[PDB]
Amino acid sequence: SCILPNNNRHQIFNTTQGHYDAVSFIYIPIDGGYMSGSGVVVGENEILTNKHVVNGAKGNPRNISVHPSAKNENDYPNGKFVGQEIIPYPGNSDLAILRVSPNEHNQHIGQVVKPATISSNTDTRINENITVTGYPGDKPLATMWESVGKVVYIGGEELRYDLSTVGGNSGSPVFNGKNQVIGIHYGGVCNKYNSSVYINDFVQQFLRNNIPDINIQ
């Protein structure tokens, strides 16, 4: 996750408004600190994020806290949901489904926010205007930031763009202008581009296979 020449980013304060509500903050304690990342609610009990993010839990999903619509370190408007099962993408992309437990009120994560709409990606192209929204670690903890830019590359399961991200953004949803998820940010090449897992037909099948209620448009 790299700061690029295009560094056009702003904080989301109304984090439950519109498509921002499914954007999720991830906190995993380690002995002596914490790993944080990002994700997006896509199903009744499911978020999407990276393999390397959930790996911070060292195989134990109950080390993972998911805070949908997190606004800041003292403001979690939807509380948190604890990891229950890690379902990695069988292919070679840095993509994982995290299934989470209900909360203390027996609410499911996909009930307290609107699950994100997944693009079928039939129209996605080079140079289209997009956003990557999540929890960059150069900002205050658990604050949501949107980063504005353009697609520069599409290939197999990789989509690249020219917009800035930072450690902490891993797992952030990539949104098109219709606020649909076209990919899942995972990293980049500093300071050439940033990159996401592209939700192509094979990744879409993995999603539907594991999240039958998924909303693909």
UniProtKB/Swiss-Prot annotation:
GO terms for biological process: proteolysis. GO terms for cellular component: extracellular region. The active site is at H52 (charge relay system), D94 (charge relay system), S170 (charge relay system). It catalyses: Preferential cleavage: Glu-|-Xaa, Asp-|-Xaa. It is an enzyme of class 3 (hydrolase). Its EC number is 3.4.21.19. It is found in: Secreted. This is Glutamyl endopeptidase. It comes from Staphylococcus epidermidis (strain ATCC 12228 / FDA PCI 1200). The chain holds residues 66 to 282 of 282 of the full protein.
